[PDB]
Each structure stands twice: as structure tokens, then as C-alpha cells.
RNA sequence: UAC
């Protein structure tokens, strides 16, 4: 029901001086006053409402507001520093915007006690409405100055991404509680928007046209479908605002609509003819389709040449890899650089001279918060082979030189399928590839004995299944099929579909591009996934160097949801199947569109418990549950349902079975940044904090059990420390034990010899759902059937 | 193949 209080403050690890992008706020103790606004029409966008309120305050200045500067949230709530002279009773007013008349009623609703909040920060376990009030106050002005996106703000600076897209720089701002004081979280952000250009040029940039003069013919269906999928849902505006709901198949010269003549009779009329009659405009490009806007019952069609893409539209649809890369190159910068940019941002914002921040007596410190962090000692890693070499993670990174796999799978029989055109990928390529791969393999501890028994060329996904159907039937004990493919191709999905869901064979693909030039590290990293794909163990945590939670049987779960770019959401939960913990088992379900809550969690947890008991012959006395990607506002419901789901999964097994459940939420999408005070502590060109820095003081929840942990070594840009919030804990973990455990689990990721940002279970869950995505593409019964995995595939970490 |  309620998250546990904080048990203790972690004392383990080596102390480090840090600075967090949290800026202390001096909050007065006075009572803010809360008024409610009912504006009609009631479905106006927040910006219009803000303009209405502005003009309202400036208009009724004489009898209502006076010299007071109230702050507005864009919806229905208006706050004032000192009370409005209206009393309890509701007042109605009219506000005219320069041609429209708005009826705005204002009635006093409540009082916001800043003292209650102040005291909550000091042992009176926190009012959300007060924090939200402060938020409104702090972001009243930037909301009117810039383009608000969630808790961020953006503007237009000439930073093309291509695709009709652009880069907008801005910032994130959020009022946040912390022990004792109120913090202002300020970070530099940037996101993708759509350019303010004519739809013609949009078509040009989407279909790679240098000019609209080319393609002097009607569009390929191929093209229409792409442009349709690009512009659908976007707002346009007439050059003489509408919402594009569809794109016509027929050109503007032939696309018709029911036109009512003055006699009353209706006759079908072409868009071109209508624009020639009504607007005296002859379409220059009548061969091009139309944009169906508004209601589909309205039958409203607009030619492309008379529409412009409305400025300020954030790009939500998934970015291409090149666009994403460009975004990275434009946004990524070292930690000191980002810190300086946040400083310039604070200087530019100048909260202390803000009329509204002044009005409410709020004051913001210009210095980042001094926080003392602790670099946790990393776990050693035990490898196998003759040596049984122990590797020590230096800066969250280690290697496999003079090291073999823990239990390297002896590869005797295996096949090679190349879908690469043989001109591009030739016999000698395959030979040098298998040669190099074998040397690196023997050096890795997973010996691929003998040349490949099978090795053939093929093309088209249509031939994937039967080829496999042949292999499994002609080679006894066939362990692995190495599939070679060039560039983007749906054959990967087919190979994964048949391989994981149909026949149950381990498949390891390589890009054709990476076949010809082989680097020892690439091949080694390939073997890392190949070994775990065959059920082997690459490496384990040092047994003696582990938290006491491993004293009695414990299962580690990792859950995540993934949402579609009608298409269902994918829920994925994985569980540890040994005591290392290395090998994991996977469960995956399809569920309601954009439903974050794992609906069928109980069945999955039950299934994982069953597999655990089958693999270890033990009933886990403790269940550790790492939940990914849950907003701070969705906590109570996801906890209420999923905790009861795990509990019910335990009860459905046995009446007496009640293991301790630790419900933890891992957040990676936040704006908490940590910087090194001493330049001697900076690591790499990024200048980031080292791998293992843990912050559970100062900027963390005043009462609850939460902590920041930066388990990964920043390679590029500024590191984002993973936040962990303990929603439940029957096991009564200490801060040190839980933080160390969470840190050590980040070293159990098998796809790389380095510490990752989030623990292996959550990452694995993400991989499972991401694989289910490819399992889908190729009614609920059929989907759940297509996502289900072959039983022989099930034991093994196929998602690796 | 591995933010
Ligand atoms: Mg997720």
C-alpha cells in the first residue's frame, strides 16, 4: 500500500564530492490562495487559456486583481500570493480576445499552506498539491515565453535532421522535494520537431525530391503510403488550422466531394474544380493527392499546395537511425560542457528577477547542490577455463585476455546460412571468418571444433523456414545456425520467428558488412552471445564477494513494458534460474494498447517460479522485482496491482508459500545530473562520474527509500545515473546491501564485459519485448500464439 | 557484434 520509510543511509564505498543540477529554493511560509477557472468553450488549448487569463488580469485590473500577479496552469487552476477581493462567491466575467468572446468564471476553492509542505520536509510523512502549486508558479512565465512540452520548454533557433524534421533546443524544469529543502531541477534538453514548411516541400524532403517539378506524374502507391504515414496526425494550415486525418488515393483533379447547389440538389464535385470556382485558384499540381482533414464525415479535402505544416509540432513518430545519430551528435557533449550550459541556462533564466517568482517570495540559489556521493567497490568476475581467471572491473570495464568462459559450450556441429549475395560475400570470406572466429573462440573458452558441416547461400525470407526445416532434419544435434545478411531486411525477423517460435534452434546472425573485415573484439563480443545462446555461462560474480541475500534461495525478476511506435503493447518479465545469477528465463505477453500495467503478471511470475523450482530444485525465499519505466505519478496503481499479482502468484502455488517481495522501480528517463567537483575524479573524455557513484542523500526523497546509482562508465555525452525507488520491501534491506546488490547485478550482463546502466534482469526484459516485436510482424489468440516460444528455446537466453 |  505505502512505500516503506528509508531504513538507513548507505555508508559503504569511497566518498566523492559531487554537484547535482538541483537548485535550492527559499520558500516563504505564507499561504497561497487557490481559485478555480471555468472557461467556455472548455476544450481550448492551454496556450489560448493562458492568453485569456493574461488579458483577463490586465482587463479587470481595477475591480478584481489589482497589482497582484497571479500564476496560471493553463487549465482550470489560478493561484495568487495574496487573496483576491472576491470572497467565497463565484464571479463571472467576459474577456474579448483580439474577435472572440470568452465567459470566464472564477471562484475561490482552497488554501495552499506552504508551512505544511515545509514541515513535511521535516518528519511529517508530502502534500502533492503544494508542490504542484509551486510548479505552476515557477513555470508560469516560461509557459508563455516558450513552447511547453510536458515538463520542458523549447524554441526555434537551421538544425536539419532530414525527413521534414528539425532539432529544437530547450530545457527541463521541475519542482522537486528533497530532505529539508525544496529543489529546482534544471537540465538542458533537445528534441525533434517538424519544420514550418509548405506541404509540397515536406513531400520533397520525405520522398527525397530535389524539387516538386520532378515526379510530374501521380505518386506511386509506394510513395503515397509513405507520405501518408509521415503526415498523418499532423496539423496543417491554409495559406488563404486543420488536423490531417488521411491522404487521398485519387489526385486533386479527380478526387470528388458532395457539393450542395443553391437548388438543394447535391452533385459530386472535384477538388480542383471547387478551388477554381470558389477561390479563383487553379491548382499547379492537380496530379498530387489531397489531405483529408477534420472529421471523415465532413469530407474535407485540401490540395497540398495550399497547406503549410503548423510550427511547434513535436515529432513523436520514431526517428530513423541517421536522424537519431544526427540528434546524438547535436545533443551529446561532455559533462563539464553540459554543466556549463546549465549554468548559462540559470544565468539566462534569472529566476530571482522573475516578477511571478518575486510575487510569491520564492528565491532560487544560483549554485548547484553540493552532494556527497559514494563510489561502490565493483564485484570481481569469475571466469572458467583451465585458469578460472578473475577479472577486476576497472572503470566499469574489463576484458577477456587470458580468460576463458565459465562453462564454455563445446561446439562440434553447426551450420552457416548466408543471405548475402555471393558476389558480395564469397567462399573465402566464409573461410577467413570461420578461421578467425575459431581462433578467437578457442581463446574465449568456447571451442568451435571442426569446420562448419553446412554452409550455403540463399535469398528471400521465404526460404528461411524450409532451409531450417532441412537442417534440423539432416544434422543430428545441430547446435547453431550462423545467418549472414546484408543491411536492413525482414529476413531477420523470419529467422528469429522460425528459430525461436517454430523449430527452436539457436540462431546467431552477423551483418554481411562485418563478415569481410573481422576485428578480434567484434568476434569475441559475438561469441559472448553465442555461448549464452547455447546455454553456457560466460562468467559469474565472485561467490565470496556477494551480499548476504544469497544466503538463502532468491529469484531476481526483471519486468518491462515496451509500447508500439491498434498495435498491442508488449509486457516482458524475466527471472533468474540459478544462484550465480547468470542464466535467465523469459516470459512475454501482448496486451492493451499503451497499457503500462502488466495485466497478466501473476501467470508470468508463477511460470518463472515453476521454472526456478525445476532448474534449482529450490523454492525462492525472496523475490527481488526490478520494474522498468514507470512514471512517478503511476506508482500507486502499478504497485497496487503488480504487488498483489506477485503475491497471488505465490499463493496460487501453495497456501503456505509467502516469500519476501522487494518491489523496486528503476528509472533511466529523468533529468538528474551529477558532476565531479574535483577534476581529478573525472573519467574519460566525457569527464563523467566514475562507475559506482551512489547518491542517497540530499536530493533524494525526504522519507522514502530511493537512491541514484551510476553503474555504467560514461563513454559519450553526460551520464544519466539510474534512479531506484523501493516501493516495497518485506526483506528489510539496508541501503548498503541493496545498493551494492543492484550495482553487482549490473555486472551480470553477458552481451558485454562492462557494467551496464540498469541491472541485467530489466535489460533482459527489454530485450525480450524487443524480440517479441520481431516475432509479431509476419486475433488475440493468434498474437499470443505468435509471441509464444518453442519449449526448447525457452530454457536458453535466446533474447541475448 | 557490443550509449
Ligand atoms: Mg519499458
Phi and psi angles of residue A365, each rounded to the nearest 5 degrees, phi first: -70, 140
Contacts made by residues A542-545, CB under 8 angstroms, sequence distance 24+: A542/A379, A542/A380, A542/A381, A542/A382, A542/A390, A543/A382, A545/A379, A545/A380
Q: Say if residue A301 is in the same domain as residue A446.
A: no
Compute CA distances A8 → A545, A547, A681, whole Å.
22, 16, 27
Task: Report CA(A160)–C1'(B3) in Å, whole number.
Answer: 22
For residue A436, what is the domain's CATH number?
3.40.50.2300
Which residue, A473, A471, A453, A479, is CA-closest to A536?
A479
Quickly give A333 CA vs B3 C1' distance in Å.
Answer: 13
Give the residue among A145, A158, A240, A154 at the shortest CA–CA distance from A196: A158
C-alpha cell at A398: 574489463
CA of A399 to C1' of B3 (A): 18
Span from the CA of A629 to the centroid of ligand 1 (angstroms): 5
Q: Of A266, A288, A314, which one is at a domain's C-terminal end?
A: A314
Resolution in A: 3.0
Q: Nearest nt (C1') to A751 (CA)?
A: B2
Residue ranges making up the domain that contains A6? 1-194+315-374
Burial annotation A593-622 (CB, 10 A radius, 16+ → b, else e): eeebbbbebbbbbbbbbebbeeeeeeebbb
Å between A358 CA and B1 C1'? Answer: 56
Per the DSSP assignment, residues forming a β-bridge with A153 are A148, A171
Distance B2 C1' – A24 CA (angstroms): 40
* Bases in strand B with any atom closer than 7 Å to a protein CB: 1-3
- Among residues A91, A89, A101, which one has the least CA distance to residue A40? A101
CA of A177 to C1' of B2 (A): 38
Task: Specify which residues A374 forms β-bridges with.
Answer: A15, A694
Q: What cell numbers appear for A43 in the block? A: 476544450
What angle, rounded to 10 degrees, do the helices at A635-653 and A601-616 form?
A: 50
- Nearest nucleotide relative to A529: CA against C1': B1
Residue A485: which nucleotide is closest by CA–C1'? B1
Last residue in a domain, options A544, A560, A578: A544
C1'-nearest nucleotide to the CA of A752: B2
**Can you give A74-91 as a three-state secondary structure string?**
CCCEEEECCCCCCCCCCE
Q: Do both A250 and A362 map to the same domain?
A: no
Say yes or no: A303 and A319 in one domain: no
Count of domains in chain A?
A: 4
The secondary structure of A429-466, three-state, reads HHHHHHHHHHHHHHHHCCCECCCCCEEEECCCHHHHHH
Query: What H or E segment, with its residue span, contains residue A710?
Result: strand A706-710
Picking from A375, A365, A11, the residue whose alpha carbon sits closest to that of residue A183 is A365
Same domain, A358 and A481: no
Q: Are residues A165 and A66 in the same domain?
A: yes
The CATH number assigned to the domain holding A641 equals 3.30.420.10
Vertex A478, ends A472 and A479: CA angle to 5°? 130
A595 CA distance to ligand 1 centroid (A)?
Answer: 11
Shared domain for A60 and A179, answered yes or no, is: yes
Our separate counts of H helices and E strands in chain A read 20, 36
Q: Is A320 helix (H, G, I), strand (E, B) or coil?
A: coil
The rounded Å distance from CA A151 to ligand 1 centre is 20
Check if the beta carbon of residue A270 is closer than 8 Å to that of residue A286.
Answer: no
Cell readout for A78 is: 489560478
Same domain, A385 and A409: yes
- Taking the centre of ligand 1 as the mean of its atom positions, its distance from the CA of residue A770, in whole angstroms, is 10
Q: What is the three-class DSSP state of A531?
A: helix
A175 and A212, same structural domain?
no
C-alpha cell recorded at residue A772: 517479441
Nearest nucleotide to A509, CA against C1' atoms: B1
> Is the same domain home to A790 and A672?
yes
A560 and A436 in a common domain = no
Tell me: do A731 and A789 sit in the same domain: yes
Question: Grid coordinates representing A658?
Answer: 509467502
Q: How far apart are CA A290 and CA A310, in angstroms?
A: 17
| Biggest alpha carbon–alpha carbon distance for chain A | 96
Angle, CA of A188, A191 and A193, to the nearest 5°: 140
> What CATH number does the domain containing A287 carry?
2.170.260.10
Q: How far is the CA of A776 from the centre of ligand 1 (A)?
A: 18
Report CA A521 to chain centroid distance, whole Å.
29
Q: What does the buried/exposed string (b/e) look like for A5-19 if buried means 16 or more CB atoms within 10 Å of the residue's CB? A: ebbeebebbeebebb
**Statement to judge: residues A223 and A296 lie in one domain:** yes
DSSP designation for A558: E
The total of other beta-carbon atoms located within 10 Å of residue A386's CB is 7
> Do the beta carbons of residue A747 and residue A680 sit within 8 Å?
no
Separation of alpha carbons A744 and A185, rounded Å? 29
Beta bridge partners of A588: A572
Helix (H, G, I), strand (E, B) or coil at A346: helix
- List, as residue ranges, the binding site of A for a divalent metal cation: 560, 628, 766
Instruction: Report how far ligand 1's centroid is from the alpha carbon of A772 (Å).
Output: 13
Instruction: Tell me the C-alpha distance between A77 and A39, whole Å.
Output: 11
* Structural domain ending residue among the three candidates A544, A559, A584: A544
Whole-number Å distance between alpha carbons of A496 and A30: 62
DSSP string computed for A118-166? HHHTTT----HHHHHHHHHHHHHHHHHHSEEETTEEE-----B-SSSEE
Amino acid at each position: 500500500f505505502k512505500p516503506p520509510p528509508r531504513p538507513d543511509f548507505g555508508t559503504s564505498g569511497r566518498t566523492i564530492k559531487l554537484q547535482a543540477n538541483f537548485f535550492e529554493m527559499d520558500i516563504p511560509k505564507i499561504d497561497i490562495y487557490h481559485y478555480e477557472l471555468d472557461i467556455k468553450p472548455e476544450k481550448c488549448p492551454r496556450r489560448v487559456n493562458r492568453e485569456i487569463v493574461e488579458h483577463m488580469v490586465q482587463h479587470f485590473k481595477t475591480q478584481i486583481f489589482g497589482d497582484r500577479k497571479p500564476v496560471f496552469d493553463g487549465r482550470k487552476n489560478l493561484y495568487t500570493a495574496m487573496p483576491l477581493p472576491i470572497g467565497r462567491d463565484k464571479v463571472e466575467l467576459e474577456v474579448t480576445l483580439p474577435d472572440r468572446i470568452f465567459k470566464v468564471s472564477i471562484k475561490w476553492v482552497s488554501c495552499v499552506s506552504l508551512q505544511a509542505l515545509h514541515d513535511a520536509l521535516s518528519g511529517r510523512l508530502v502534500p502533492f498539491e503544494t508542490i504542484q502549486a509551486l510548479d505552476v508558479v515557477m513555470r508560469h512565465l516560461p509557459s508563455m515565453r516558450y513552447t511547453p512540452v510536458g515538463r520542458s520548454f523549447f524554441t526555434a533557433s537551421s538544425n536539419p535532421l532530414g525527413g521534414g524534421r528539425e532539432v529544437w533546443f530547450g530545457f527541463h524544469q521541475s519542482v522537486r522535494p528533497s530532505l529539508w529543502k525544496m529543489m529546482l531541477n534544471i537540465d538542458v534538453s533537445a528534441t525533434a520537431f517538424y519544420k514550418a514548411q509548405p506541404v509540397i516541400e515536406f513531400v520533397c524532403e520525405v520522398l527525397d525530391f530535389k524539387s516538386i517539378e520532378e515526379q510530374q506524374k501521380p505518386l506511386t502507391d509506394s510513395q503515397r503510403v509513405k507520405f501518408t504515414k509521415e503526415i498523418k496526425g499532423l496539423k496543417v494550415e491554409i495559406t488563404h488550422k486543420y488536423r490531417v486525418c488521411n491522404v487521398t488515393r485519387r489526385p486533386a483533379s479527380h478526387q470528388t466531394f458532395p457539393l450542395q447547389q443553391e437548388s438543394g440538389q447535391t452533385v459530386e464535385c472535384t477538388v480542383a474544380q471547387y478551388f477554381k470556382d470558389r477561390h479563383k485558384l487553379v491548382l499547379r499540381y492537380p496530379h498530387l493527392p489531397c489531405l483529408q482533414v477534420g472529421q471523415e464525415q465532413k469530407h474535407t479535402y485540401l490540395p497540398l499546395e495550399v497547406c503549410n505544416i503548423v510550427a511547434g509540432q513535436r515529432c513523436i513518430k520514431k526517428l530513423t537511425d541517421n536522424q537519431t545519430s544526427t540528434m546524438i551528435r547535436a545533443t551529446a557533449r561532455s559533462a563539464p560542457d553540459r554543466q556549463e550550459e546549465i549554468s548559462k541556462l540559470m544565468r539566462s533564466a534569472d529566476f530571482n528577477t522573475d516578477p511571478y517568482v518575486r510575487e510569491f517570495g520564492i528565491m532560487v540559489k544560483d549554485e548547484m547542490t553540493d552532494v556527497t556521493g559514494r563510489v561502490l567497490q565493483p564485484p570481481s568476475i569469475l571466469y572458467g577455463g583451465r585458469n578460472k581467471a578473475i577479472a577486476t572491473p576497472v572503470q566499469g570495464v574489463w576484458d577477456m585476455r587470458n580468460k576463458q568462459f565459465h562453462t564454455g559450450i563445446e561446439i562440434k556441429v553447426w551450420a552457416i546460412a548466408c543471405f548475402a549475395p555471393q558476389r558480395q560475400c564469397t567462399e573465402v570470406h566464409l573461410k577467413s571468418f570461420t578461421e578467425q572466429l575459431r581462433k578467437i573462440s578457442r581463446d574465449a573458452g568456447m571451442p568451435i571444433q571442426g569446420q562448419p558441416c553446412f554452409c550455403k547461400y540463399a535469398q528471400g525470407a521465404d526460404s528461411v523456414e524450409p532451409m531450417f526445416r532441412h537442417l534440423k532434419n539432416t544434422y543430428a544435434g545441430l547446435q547453431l545456425v550462423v545467418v549472414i545478411l546484408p543491411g536492413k531486411t525482414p529476413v531477420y525477423a523470419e529467422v528469429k520467428r522460425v528459430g525461436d517460435t517454430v523449430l527452436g534452434m539457436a540462431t546467431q546472425c552477423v551483418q554481411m558488412k562485418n563478415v569481410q573485415r573481422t576485428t578480434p573484439q567484434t568476434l569475441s563480443n559475438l561469441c559472448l552471445k553465442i555461448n549464452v545462446k547455447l546455454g553456457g555461462v560466460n562468467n559469474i560474480l565472485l561467490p565470496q564477494g556477494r551480499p548476504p541475500v544469497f544466503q538463502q534461495p532468491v529469484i531476481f525478476l526483471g519486468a518491462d513494458v515496451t509500447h508500439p511506435p491498434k498495435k498491442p503493447s508488449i509486457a516482458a518479465v524475466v527471472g533468474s534460474m540459478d544462484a550465480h545469477p547468470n542464466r535467465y528465463c523469459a516470459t512475454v505477453r501482448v496486451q492493451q494498447h499503451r497499457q503500462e500495467i502488466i495485466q497478466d503478471l501473476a501467470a508470468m511470475v508463477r511460470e518463472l517460479l515453476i521454472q526456478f523450482y525445476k532448474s534449482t530444485r529450490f523454492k525462492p525465499t525472496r523475490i527481488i522485482f526490478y520494474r522498468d519505466g514507470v512514471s512517478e505519478g503511476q506508482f500507486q496503481q502499478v504497485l497496487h496491482h503488480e504487488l498483489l499479482a506477485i503475491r497471488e502468484a505465490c499463493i496460487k502455488l501453495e497456501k503456505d508459500y509467502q516469500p519476501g517481495i522487494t518491489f523496486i522501480v528503476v528509472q533511466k528517463r529523468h533529468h538528474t545530473r551529477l558532476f565531479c567537483t574535483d577534476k581529478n575524479e573525472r573519467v574519460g573524455k566525457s569527464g563523467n562520474i566514475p562507475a559506482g557513484t551512489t547518491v542517497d542523500t540530499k536530493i533524494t526523497h525526504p522519507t522514502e527509500f530511493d537512491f541514484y546509482l551510476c553503474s555504467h562508465a560514461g563513454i559519450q555525452g553526460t551520464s544519466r545515473p539510474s534512479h531506484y525507488h523501493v516501493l516495497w520491501d518485506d526483506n528489510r534491506f539496508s541501503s548498503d546491501e541493496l545498493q551494492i546488490l543492484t550495482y553487482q547485478l549490473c555486472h551480470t550482463y553477458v552481451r558485454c564485459t562492462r557494467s551496464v546502466s540498469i541491472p541485467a534482469p530489466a535489460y533482459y526484459a527489454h530485450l525480450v519485448a524487443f524480440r517479441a516485436r520481431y516475432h509479431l510482424v509476419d486475433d488475440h489468440q493468434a498474437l499470443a500464439k505468435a509471441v509464444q516460444v518453442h519449449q526448447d528455446t525457452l530454457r536458453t537466453m535466446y533474447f541475448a
